[PDB]
Structure formats: C-alpha cells, structure tokens
Amino acid sequence: ARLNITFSPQAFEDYKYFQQNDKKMVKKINELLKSIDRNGALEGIGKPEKLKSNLTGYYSRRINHEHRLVYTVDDNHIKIASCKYHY
Amino acid sequence: ARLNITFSPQAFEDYKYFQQNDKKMVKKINELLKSIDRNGALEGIGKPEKLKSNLTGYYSRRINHEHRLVYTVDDNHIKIASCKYHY
Amino acid sequence: MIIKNYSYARQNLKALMTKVNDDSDMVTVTSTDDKNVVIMSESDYNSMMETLYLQQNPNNAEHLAQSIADLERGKTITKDIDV
Amino acid sequence: HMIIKNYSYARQNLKALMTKVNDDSDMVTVTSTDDKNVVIMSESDYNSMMETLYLQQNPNNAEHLAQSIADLERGKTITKDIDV
C-alpha cells in the first residue's frame, strides 16, 4: 500500500491535482506504479514501451487513452517524469 | 533569377544571418528553393520528405546534415517555416 | 493498418508491398514465436524519422510550431529572393 | 542497425530476417525494381516510435517532458511515500 516514488515537480502537481479532482485517475496511476514495482519497467498492464529520441531511458504506460505515465526505474526506485499530457 | 518567397519571422532572421555570415548556406537554400519551384514539393535535390504529427502538410529538405529547409507549397507559392535547426 | 500472419505474408509479399505504398497502410506479421514485426513503406519510415529528428530538441519543436502558426496567421515576411 | 535486401531475397528468407529484427533490434529495408520499398521493424520498435511521436507532437508536452526529465536528472524533485 506504500511506494516511495520520486516525482518531477510538474508530475507531482498533476498527481496532486488528480487527487482533488479525479480519484478514478489516481487509482489507475497507482495500479501502474504497483505493476512497475512488481514486474519491472517492461512487463504488466498499460502496454509498457521503451521511449526513443530524447526520451531514451524512459518508458510509457497508458493511464487512459490520452494520458501516459512516463517513468524510469533507477535501481528498483521509480522516478516519474509525467502522469498527464500537457497540451 | 527571382523567386517570391514567404518566410516565417524566425526563418527570415536565420536567412538574414546566413546572408551576413555564411554565404555557402544561402546558395544551398536558394538551390533547394529553385528545385521546389520547378519540380514541386516532393521532387529534386535534398531528399524531400513529407513530415508527420503537428508538421503534417509541411516538407523537409536537407540544407546540410544538420539544417533542414522546412517548407510548404501553397498553389505553387513557397512558404518557409524554417531554414535552420534551433537547439 | 493490416493484421496478417507469417504463412500468408510469405506467399504474396509483393502484393503487400504495393498495398502499403499506395494505400499508405501498415502490416503486422504475426509469428508463433511471439516475435512480431511491422511492415511500412520506406517513405512513411523516413517521414517519422525526420519528424522525430525535428522534434527531438524542444527548442526546435517550439521553433517549428511558432513558425507554422505565424505562417497560418500571416505574421510573416514575403520578399523577392535573388536565387 | 539497418539491413538492405531486395525482393527475391526477402521472399524465402522471411523468418531469417524476422528473427534477427526482433533479436538484434535490427531493421530491414526491402528494395524493389519499381522502388516502392518497405521497411520491416519489430512491433516493439514500431510502438516505441509511435508512442514517442505521440508524446512529442504537442510542443507544450515535448517541453514538459524535457523540463521534467531535466529536473529528475539534477535532483530538483519531490520524493514521497504514496498510498497505492
């Protein structure tokens, strides 16, 4: 029920915003995080995929059709670059 | 020979920079422009390529290995979005 | 975007190569070894690589989006150019 | 890791190329006489490419990803225990 997660500042603001406006979105993000902690970066729900170009080293999983969880795993520690598409 | 060319403001500033500081760049750009005017957006020197995503409708040709001429052709009129990579 | 298997795709390879170039389509070829591949036209492949090249640096992605917007808006500079 | 062969090679050497595309992360270009060539890549590489383009295609999101990855790299970050 607890995960020690490192956020980028914009990823944390979007995560907090989801907490007071869309708990259905927080729960789906949390399910992705739990899957990453259990299975590693490339296995589990959310269609995990490596990213390329200047996103090399990071991965994406689908939160919904629009939003992506963009993350990397550094010695089993999860770092979150994004949890919300910024149009 | 004279071609009537529409520039984005940043593309014009980079062309003017090339006129003062790099005349070999201007000559290659001018060569690509002559080739677009005679052959259309997809034929001729510079490996012309359709672009995707938010650049759909625009085309790129190689000025050198780094700089692209990013352009569109609107009823045989050439519009330049870019003639220099912005790092 | 087309989904076929191996043994179909091994037969009419040329029929699938003409179909992805003219209809701008894609083919996923499925194997029993869980080692699938995607077939696209070389034109579409080079376009995506060139698009990723132009968007790879955020200053350049911003420069392109502002410039394309300026051209659509008519905030622009039109000159006769000695070519 | 690009490999360039012609059409008649690619007909009967199909798994020989499909496996080395997935195992070695290679790609294969198949040339043609009418030059409507094709490129073969793994489904992972195709999805990775499409996902990267999706994330870059709005400049506000490309900038948000660049800024966030930068902040992660220098440690300007927020680390919390969160309920999951």
What would you note in describing this structure?
The complex is a heterotetramer, with 2 copies of chain A (87 residues) and 2 copies of chain C. Chain A has 87 residues and is an alpha+beta fold. Chain A has one domain (1-87). Chain A contains 2 helices and 5 strands; from the N terminus they run E-H-H-E-E-E-E. In chain A, strands 1-5-4-3-2 form a 5-stranded mixed β-sheet, covered by helices on one side. Chain C is α+β, with helices and mostly antiparallel strands and 83 residues long. Chain C has helices at 6-11, 13-22, 42-55, 58-73, and strands spanning 2-5, 27-30, 37-41, 77-82. A 3-stranded mixed β-sheet of chain C has the order 1-2-3. The longest helix of chain C has 16 residues, at 58-73. Chain C is elongated, with a radius of gyration of 20 Å. In chain C, 33% of the residues are buried. Chains in contact: A-C, A-D, B-C, B-D, C-D. Strand 1 of chain B pairs antiparallel with strand 4 (77-82) of chain C, so a sheet runs across the interface.
**Fraction of residues of chain C in helices?**
55-70%
Beta-strand share of residues of chain C:
15-25%
Major sheet: arrangement of strands of chain A: 1-5-4-3-2
Give the topology string of chain A: H per helix, E per strand: EHHEEEE
Domain count of chain A: the total is 1
PDB class: toxin/antitoxin
Keywords: toxin-antitoxin, microbial RNase, YoeB, Staphylococcus aureus, toxin, TOXIN-ANTITOXIN complex
Assembly: tetrameric
Entry title: Crystal structure of heterotetrameric complex of YoeB-YefM toxin-antitoxin from Staphylococcus aureus.
Brief account:
Chain A is α+β, with helices and mostly antiparallel strands and 87 residues long. Helices cover 32% and strands 29% of the residues of chain A.
Any key phrases for this structure?
heterotetramer, A: 87 residues, alpha+beta, five-stranded mixed beta sheet, 2 helices, 29% strand, globular, C: 83 residues, 2 domains, three-stranded mixed beta sheet, 4 helices, elongated, toxin/antitoxin
